[PDB]
Amino acid sequence: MGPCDIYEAGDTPCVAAHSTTRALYSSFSGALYQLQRGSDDTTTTISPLTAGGIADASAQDTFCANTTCLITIIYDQSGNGNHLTQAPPGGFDGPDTDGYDNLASAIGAPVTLNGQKAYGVFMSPGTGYRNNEATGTATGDEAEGMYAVLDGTHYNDACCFDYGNAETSSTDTGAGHMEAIYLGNSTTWGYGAGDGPWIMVDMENNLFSGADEGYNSGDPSISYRFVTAAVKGGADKWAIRGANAASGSLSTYYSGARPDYSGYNPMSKEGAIILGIGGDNSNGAQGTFYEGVMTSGYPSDDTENSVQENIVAAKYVVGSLVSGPSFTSGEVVSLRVTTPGYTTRYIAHTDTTVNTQVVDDDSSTTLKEEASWTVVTGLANSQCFSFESVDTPGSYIRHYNFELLLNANDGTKQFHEDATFCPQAALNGEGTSLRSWSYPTRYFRHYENVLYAASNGGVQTFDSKTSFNNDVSFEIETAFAS
Ligand SMILES: *[C@@H]1O[C@H](CO)[C@@H](O[C@@H]2O[C@H](CO)[C@@H](O)[C@H](O)[C@H]2NC(C)=O)[C@H](O)[C@H]1NC(C)=O
Ligand SMILES: OC[C@@H]1O[C@@H](O)[C@H](O)[C@H]1O
Ligand SMILES: OC[C@@H]1O[C@@H](O)[C@H](O)[C@H]1O
Ligand SMILES: OC[C@@H]1O[C@@H](O)[C@H](O)[C@H]1O
């Protein structure tokens, strides 16, 4: 039995089931999600290896070789056709073309389920999926349940990393017009105990951690690498239950009446489905989605417990984020450009501007150091790395507005994430391609001799597809600064 088989057995069937890692029905063998590669913009789908099995990761690896991939669609496994596609603009515009939100990279969240490789949906700020014409989802004050397996270490405090029921117009139509899971450490509305993140319920114009607007001591911080967030809502009742998706049971953080404020009872749910964004399309949040569903009816705690047991049984384990050459902490290197006509240039910097410059043995000691980098354990992820300037110790290469800059480490999470890059076998086959950890659709990329965190095609001029593969491939050589 899969999660939806369990929910069905409890008389509160899935009306929407999404996952890029596995089938949520023991009998599902259809498409889990769709891919699109930057090379030729063609697409393909990824299905379970076997009915009710794990996603065929190899099929994706094959399709995305020597290029970049985006997850265009996360299919609804229930049969209701509630597929999630690129979120459109609404109260707020997304950063993509015509106000749409970005699609997520297909390789930002590698994992293994009971030993089998799979990919989750790593969502950076500006990313979002949605379906504004879903079927079977609860509307009005109708009861519903939902859960999602997320990454408790990947989040932020901006609105809003959600998964659940939302407005069909992508606008904030008022209190009670939403009901979705939220995971992050936003304190703009509600918030729990500690430093966060907290699993809360977005009911529109409020993220609730409990009965009162704002602070609620009953909602603990939950930062497990894999978090099971289970939320449900019915006639003047709702609950928050959380757990380590890798082990143990669900704990109830809240169970009771609707917050006693106008508009929350009865609810006015609209039935749309959102992922990684807010109801009005607020798109500043980040997070990772592995699997999740929405149901019809209020799930009993027993049913959810069985679901949690199934998720634990799935044995989620973090996958490798690195491929190709790679480095060792403390190693000093120089990175050479492999793009024809610029092969004598190296990644260097002039003050805070990271760029490429012709560097050779006749270069000054200062320029040699400016083109030399001390590789250290990734500031935001120990699997990846951060690049510290040799001439300016304490400063690292970090992206800011997608431009690579050399700034001093201020010790903040933001800086840490902006300065973490994951090595990937060079797309052009020559050396390495440094993929941004926080924005997996972006790579170290030189454009007109300046470094950026660029995507294979995009709204910025430096995201040009022209010479992308070459512009993101660098040869690792001995540092000039020795
Ligand atoms: C959510 O959590 C992060 C991480 O603990 C908080 O970020 C810090 O941000 C403040 C405000 O800029 C800085 O003084 C600290 O130096 C940061 N600490 C770290 C460890 O990065 C963030 O403020 C929290 N958000 C809210 C709304 O409370
Ligand atoms: O309720 C929290 C957020 O506030 C509104 O702006 C968004 O639609 C919603 O997700
Ligand atoms: O580079 C993209 C974003 O721009 C800046 O606002 C942030 O520091 C960074 O994460
Ligand atoms: O960075 C130098 C060149 O400038 C641009 O024309 C290309 O993207 C790049 O190869």
Residue closest by Cα to atom 9 of ligand 1: 412
Element (H, E) at 220: none
Report yes or no: 245 and 132 within 8 Å, Cβ to Cβ.
no
CATH number, domain containing residue 353: 2.80.10.50
Per-residue burial over 303-327, b = 16 or more CB atoms within 10 Å of its CB, e = otherwise: bbbbbbebbbebbbebbebbbbbbb
Residue 468 is part of which domain span?
A: 321-482
> Do 331 and 279 sit in the same domain of this protein?
no
Which bound ligand lies closest to the C-alpha atom of 341? 4
Q: Which atom of ligand 4 is nearest to the CA of 464?
A: 8
Residue closest by Cα to atom 6 of ligand 4: 448
Catalytic residue among 162, 179, 270, 280: 280
Helix (H, G, I), strand (E, B) or coil at 274: strand
Expressed in angstroms and rounded, the spacing between residue 186 Cα and the centre of ligand 1 is: 10
Residue closest by Cα to atom 9 of ligand 3: 400
How far, rounded to the nearest angstrom, does the alpha carbon of residue 254 sit from its chain's CA centroid? 26
> Do 152 and 129 sit in the same domain of this protein?
yes
Query: For 283-319, what is the HEC assignment?
Result: CCCCEEEEEEEEECCCCCHHHHHHHHHHHHHHCEEEC
> Do 315 and 347 sit in the same domain of this protein?
no
> Do 345 and 355 sit in the same domain of this protein?
yes
> Do 384 and 295 sit in the same domain of this protein?
no
Which of 297, 320, 343 terminates a domain? The answer is 320
Q: What are phi and psi of 254, to 5 degrees?
A: -160, 140
Single-letter residue type at 42:
T
> Do 288 and 149 sit in the same domain of this protein?
yes
> Do 170 and 253 sit in the same domain of this protein?
yes
> Do 338 and 294 sit in the same domain of this protein?
no
CATH number, domain containing residue 238: 2.60.120.200
**Cβ(42) – ligand 1 distance below 6 Å:** no
Q: How many domains, the chain? A: 2
Expressed in angstroms and rounded, the spacing between residue 446 Cα and the centre of ligand 4 is: 6
Which of 268, 300, 320 terminates a domain? The answer is 320
Expressed in angstroms and rounded, the spacing between residue 47 Cα and the centre of ligand 3 is: 35
Nearest to 293 by CA among 163, 206, 407, 401: 163
> Do 299 and 358 sit in the same domain of this protein?
no
**Cβ(402) – ligand 3 distance below 6 Å:** yes
Which of 320, 354, 371 terminates a domain? The answer is 320
> Do 403 and 289 sit in the same domain of this protein?
no
Alpha carbon distances (Å) from 28 to 54, 76, 364: 11, 11, 63
> Do 40 and 146 sit in the same domain of this protein?
yes
> Do 335 and 302 sit in the same domain of this protein?
no
Nearest to 24 by CA among 231, 292, 336: 292
As a whole number of angstroms, the distance between CA 15 and CA 28 comes to 15
Nearest to 230 by CA among 122, 309, 287: 309
As a whole number of angstroms, the distance between CA 39 and CA 60 comes to 14
Based on the residue annotation, tell me whether 280 is a catalytic residue of this protein.
yes
Token pair in block for residue 175: 């209190």
**Cβ(195) – ligand 1 distance below 6 Å:** yes
Resolution (A): 2.1
Report yes or no: 299 and 324 within 8 Å, Cβ to Cβ.
no
